[PDB]
Amino acid sequence: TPEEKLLRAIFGEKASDVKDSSLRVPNGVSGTVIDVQVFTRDGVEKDKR
Amino acid sequence: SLSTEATAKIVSEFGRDANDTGSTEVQVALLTAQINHLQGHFAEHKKDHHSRRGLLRMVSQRRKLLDYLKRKDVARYTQLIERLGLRR
Amino acid sequence: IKVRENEPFDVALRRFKRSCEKAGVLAEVRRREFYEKPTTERKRAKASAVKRHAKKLARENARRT
Amino acid sequence: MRHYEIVFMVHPDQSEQVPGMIERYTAAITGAEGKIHRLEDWGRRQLAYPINKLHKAHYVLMNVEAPQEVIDELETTFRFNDAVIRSMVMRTKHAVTEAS
Amino acid sequence: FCRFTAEGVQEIDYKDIATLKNYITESGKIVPSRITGTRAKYQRQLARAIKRARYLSLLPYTDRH
Amino acid sequence: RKQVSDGVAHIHASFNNTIVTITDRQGNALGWATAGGSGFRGSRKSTPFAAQVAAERCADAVKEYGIKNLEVMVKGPGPGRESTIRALNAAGFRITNITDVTPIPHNGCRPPKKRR
RNA sequence: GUUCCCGGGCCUUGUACACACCGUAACAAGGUAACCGUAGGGGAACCUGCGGUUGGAUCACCUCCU
RNA sequence: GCUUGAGUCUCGUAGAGGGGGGUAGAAUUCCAGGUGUAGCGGUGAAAUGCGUAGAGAUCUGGAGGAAUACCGGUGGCGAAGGCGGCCCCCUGGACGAAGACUGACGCUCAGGUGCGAAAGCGUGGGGAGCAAACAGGAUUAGAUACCCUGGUAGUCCACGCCGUAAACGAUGUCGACUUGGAGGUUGUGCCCUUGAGGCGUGGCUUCCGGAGCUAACGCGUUAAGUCGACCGCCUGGGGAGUA
């Protein structure tokens, strides 16, 4: 909206653009995460984990 | 803005409680305490055409407060002028 | 202040300079001070600044033209 | 007694001997009522405008709890030290801990 | 309307200037309390802190002298 | 001469005069051009067309020096500031960057006075 | 085609005018807005500097971003 | 004797509020040095002045002097006047949640006392910019008048004197009462401040309106509406707010 295009170009580069659309725990399950299989970008590493 | 751990000592002396600073004998003393730390400014700086309105204000308030205690309780007033020495 | 742009110009591009002040401080430090002046003219300016909003309130209720 | 936020800076030249100079100032506080809250070391980061010639100074923040009459004379020292060029002392309020 | 003055409480500091870039322009010009959706209190306190950031060489005056 | 590539053209437009002074980054001036030194005496100096003739008198007197990637350091948003920077970008110059280096005063001293 | 030029009408702004537009300082923005306070000066109105206020006038056009 | 009046404390905030001193940076007048040109400046126009004794212009170093663009908001402080960088110390006034009290300690005025922008002057210093008296060139029949270049007084720091105003939101002051909206500025209490808020309460200020007043415009919880308390002023203009 026009009342958030102006406020958008002030409070940073990414104010109200990036949202939270994460991968969530499947609805209806109660378990325990044991191992994490990660694949870093082919060429550039991740951050720390 | 005032010296709290000196004035709280005063309400401790004059007051029969710690919350009782509504009695004439205690309030005029807290007013004189203000004047005791006010001398420090009317000795220096010289150009206080603004701070002058504070002098005349608190002195007026004080002159008439001790002017009523005088007209009602000469027991507390003579004890007050003999307890703080706010006469001279 | 400083515009550059490596190649896609074919123009000078001094649009942020004007978008900065340009005449903003030119009109304020070029002639005599006269401390009170702006205050009075911002007066007529402010009343006419509320007037267009008064025109916004003058277009919403009727205008059955 | 009072919460202070002494934020001073030095030139990169004295940046290799200022750690010793921080021990200089914090010596006083320690033996005369004091405890530090946030000693920050940023490094020789980019300055704004060149200080008469060279840019990029060494930032050192203290933000220590100290007495008012000591910091009075302590800022006098900042005023005439060759490491510290510019400083800034604060009033009371809250004590910091992160700022990063 | 923004998710920053909905989590912004009690005097924004003068140390790291990354968010001060979000109130000033890339010229050295400050935005008024009306453009930025921020009560005068805040846009003004940020401002005073910035003048002190000039006495500390965090931000310069205008871009170039 | 000078072996300069960075021709710093200081374009200063007062009110009724466009005086451009090409120099070096060090200050070694090369010469100048003006809306009043080419003629146009009167409200004619007030026109950017005279400032256009100005940017041309400044476009020359540099063919012995050799400015190519020049810097346009503007101050004085009077008669010029428009058809002067544009005249240089039309005189065959590859301006690396047009600079508006204005060390504006906080109005410390008291300035002159005009139209009353 | 109404932006040039002569005359006309409507709406509108403005007036200490309605007996009705030796020097112009106020009344249209009188083409230099006004008045009070203070010092000084010049045949003289008034002017110059400093502080304040509204018992002042248009915010209409010409170039750029949606 | 008792409390809705006045007032203070415990617990806090904000501020062109004042005061003494010190400091940062830009611009300007000017000085030294390298480069370099014949114009700069000004106005409707011309001109005084400067210029090969090299001005204006550019970069570096720098000493006096006064003042704070952008943050700036019919916004904030105050009895009023008046007042815009930052720091250290001093400090008056205004306001609020929850309690504790003497118990009307409240309001105002002739004589009286204090503040008093700016200006005049005395005195120890000062003079960048502007600029009373005045000089040159023009508009002009004339210039001691719009303009430009110079320039004494003044402007500033500190102590005093005559003690003045459109010292005017022209609205005297303490206080109580009287359907709302757009707001702005500064705090606070309650609910999950999840959140950019909802419900009340005080200070200052602006616009449109009801009650009411009024010649009218309009003021309109900051009143010119309704009362009480205290003081000054007017009896047509001028003379004169003068000897």
Curated annotation (Swiss-Prot), chain A:
* Organism domain of life: Bacteria
Indicate the quaternary assembly. The RNAP catalytic core consists of 2 alpha, 1 beta, 1 beta' and 1 omega subunit. When a sigma factor is associated with the core the holoenzyme is formed, which can initiate transcription.
Similarity section:
Belongs to the RNA polymerase beta chain family.
Role description: DNA-dependent RNA polymerase catalyzes the transcription of DNA into RNA using the four ribonucleoside triphosphates as substrates.
In Swiss-Prot or TrEMBL terms, this protein is called: DNA-directed RNA polymerase subunit beta
Q: Which residues of the full protein are shown?
A: 896 to 944 of 1342
Curated annotation (Swiss-Prot), chain B:
Q: Name one GO molecular function term.
A: structural constituent of ribosome
Report keywords, A-Z. Ribonucleoprotein, Ribosomal protein, RNA-binding, rRNA-binding
Oligomeric state and interaction partners are given as: Part of the 30S ribosomal subunit. Forms a bridge to the 50S subunit in the 70S ribosome, contacting the 23S rRNA.
Which PANTHER family does the annotation name?
A: RIBOSOMAL PROTEIN S15, BACTERIAL AND ORGANELLAR, SMALL RIBOSOMAL SUBUNIT PROTEIN US15M
Return the SUPFAM superfamilies for the record.
S15/NS1 RNA-binding domain
Q: Per the record's keyword annotation, is Ribosomal protein included, yes or no?
A: yes
- Record's superkingdom? Bacteria
Which gene is transcribed and translated to give this protein? rpsO
Annotated organism of origin: Escherichia coli O45:K1 (strain S88 / ExPEC)
Name this polypeptide is given: Small ribosomal subunit protein uS15
Curated annotation (Swiss-Prot), chain D:
Identify one Gene Ontology CC term for this UniProt entry: cytosolic small ribosomal subunit
Q: Name one GO biological process term.
A: translation
Q: List the disulfide bonds.
A: none
Listed A to Z, the keywords are: Acetylation, Ribonucleoprotein, Ribosomal protein, RNA-binding, rRNA-binding
Residues with N6-acetyllysine modification? 93
Q: Name one GO molecular function term.
A: structural constituent of ribosome
Q: Which family does it belong to?
A: Belongs to the bacterial ribosomal protein bS6 family.
Known role: Binds together with bS18 to 16S ribosomal RNA.
Q: What is this protein called?
A: Small ribosomal subunit protein bS6
Which source organism?
Escherichia coli O17:K52:H18 (strain UMN026 / ExPEC)
Q: Encoded by which gene?
A: rpsF
Which span of the parent protein is shown here? 1 to 100 of 131
Swiss-Prot record, chain E:
Keywords linked to the UniProt accession:
Ribonucleoprotein, Ribosomal protein, RNA-binding, rRNA-binding
Q: Please name the Gene3D superfamilies in this protein's record.
A: Ribosomal protein S18
Q: Name one GO cellular component term.
A: cytosolic small ribosomal subunit
User: What are this entry's molecular-function GO terms?
Assistant: small ribosomal subunit rRNA binding; structural constituent of ribosome
Which InterPro entries does this chain map to? Answer: Ribosomal_bS18, Ribosomal_bS18_CS, Ribosomal_bS18_sf
Which Gene Ontology BP annotations are present? translation
Q: Which Pfam family is an annotated match for this chain, by its short name?
A: Ribosomal_S18
Question: Tell me, how does this one assemble?
Answer: Part of the 30S ribosomal subunit. Forms a tight heterodimer with protein bS6.
Q: Which protein family is named in the record?
A: Belongs to the bacterial ribosomal protein bS18 family.
Q: What does this protein do?
A: Binds as a heterodimer with protein bS6 to the central domain of the 16S rRNA, where it helps stabilize the platform of the 30S subunit.
Please name the HAMAP family in this protein's record. Ribosomal_bS18
What name has this protein been given in UniProt?
Small ribosomal subunit protein bS18
- The record lists the organism as Escherichia coli O45:K1 (strain S88 / ExPEC)
Instruction: Kindly list the organism's lineage.
Output: Bacteria, Pseudomonadati, Pseudomonadota, Gammaproteobacteria, Enterobacterales
Q: Which gene encodes it?
A: rpsR
